[PDB]
Write a protein that binds this ligand. Structure first.
Ligand SMILES: OCc1ccccc1
Length: 202
């Protein structure tokens, strides 16, 4: 159970300095969506920002020194106005999440079954620990109420990265230092994603 039921409630309860909405609009068919950025799901801000070099980006970040968990709003409740605008303006959505787990794992779901399966094969071939989630899996992200699915097509890829995988990409795993300690494994991962996105969306 999240602390807030929707963005209007979070905005009325939290100091505006303690979160940030960040957008990059390029006209790319694909939107990179990270609604749990900053301290909420650590490392999702950095993966989103690197992919935004080629793709449109929506980022919601928790910027508290601690207690960013209160800023988590589940995808089916996430209705921040700039997110509703940007998802509606794009053909396809890749949505970035973190979940709690020490082992290195990437769970791939979403409504775009063909591209989710292709992404898992490319990650596995490239030596990353990806599994495809199917429609009855809890992390599937197939709800029409899911922010990632409110696009022109309703086709999404949901990328859920374990704590262990996210911690593997940074010298220092802090709000302050992830963005300036990205390692060789961070660029190898984002290169596989750039390779996949250029090929899979034409
Ligand atoms: O310069 C960042 C970047 C890396 C790989 C592909 C596209 C862009």
């Amino acid at each position: 159970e999240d602390v807030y039921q929707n963005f209007e409630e979070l905005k009325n309860n939290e100091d505006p300095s303690d979160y940030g909405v960040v957008t990059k609009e390029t006209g790319s068919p694909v939107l990179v969506l990270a609604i749990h950025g900053g301290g909420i799901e650590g490392g999702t801000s950095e993966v989103a920002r690197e992919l935004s070099k080629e793709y449109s980006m929506y980022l919601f970040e928790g910027l508290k020194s601690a207690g960013n968990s209160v800023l988590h709003i589940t995808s089916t409740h996430f209705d921040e106005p700039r997110a509703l605008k940007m998802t509606g303006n794009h053909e396809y959505v890749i949505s970035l999440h973190g979940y709690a787990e020490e082992d290195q794992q990437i769970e791939v779901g979403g409504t775009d079954r063909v591209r989710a399966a292709d992404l898992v094969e490319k990650l596995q071939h490239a030596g990353f620990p990806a599994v495809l989630l199917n429609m009855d899996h809890p992390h599937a992200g197939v709800s029409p109420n899911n922010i990632a699915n409110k696009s022109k097509t309703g086709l999404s890829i949901q990328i859920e990265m374990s704590t262990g995988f996210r911690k593997s990409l940074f010298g220092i795993f802090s709000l302050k230092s992830r963005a300036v300690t990205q390692n060789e494994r961070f660029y190898e991962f984002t290169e596989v994603m750039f390779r996949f996105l250029k090929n899979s969306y034409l």
